[PDB]
């Protein structure tokens, strides 16, 4: 956390910084994007 890392998802590629969040995703959804198609929050597959 809190470092410029390169996350490697099964269907998503890109770099970013992982940190804490205040949102709450749905139990079936895994992705989260901004208005102009910008992925800014994903759910961790290991820990909910």
């Amino acid at each position: 956390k809190n470092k410029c890392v390169n996350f490697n998802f099964n269907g998503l590629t890109g770099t970013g910084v992982l940190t804490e969040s205040n949102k709450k995703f749905l139990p079936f959804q895994q992705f989260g994007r901004d208005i102009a198609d910008t992925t800014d929050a994903v759910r961790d597959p290991q820990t909910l």
Binding site: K23, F25, L26, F28, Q29, Q30, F31, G32, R33, D34, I35, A41
Partner: protein, 36 residues
């Protein structure tokens, strides 16, 4: 297996109008207060 029933009643194929049903999630993208 092949024996048909005797309590079958023929019905005409009528119609029924829906109002706002039939909406699901096309993907697993979480957004808030948008309209895409």
């Amino acid at each position: 297996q092949c024996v048909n029933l005797t309590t079958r009643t023929q019905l005409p194929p009528a119609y029924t109008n829906s109002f706002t049903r039939g909406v699901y999630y096309p993907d697993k993208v979480f957004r808030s207060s948008v309209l895409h």
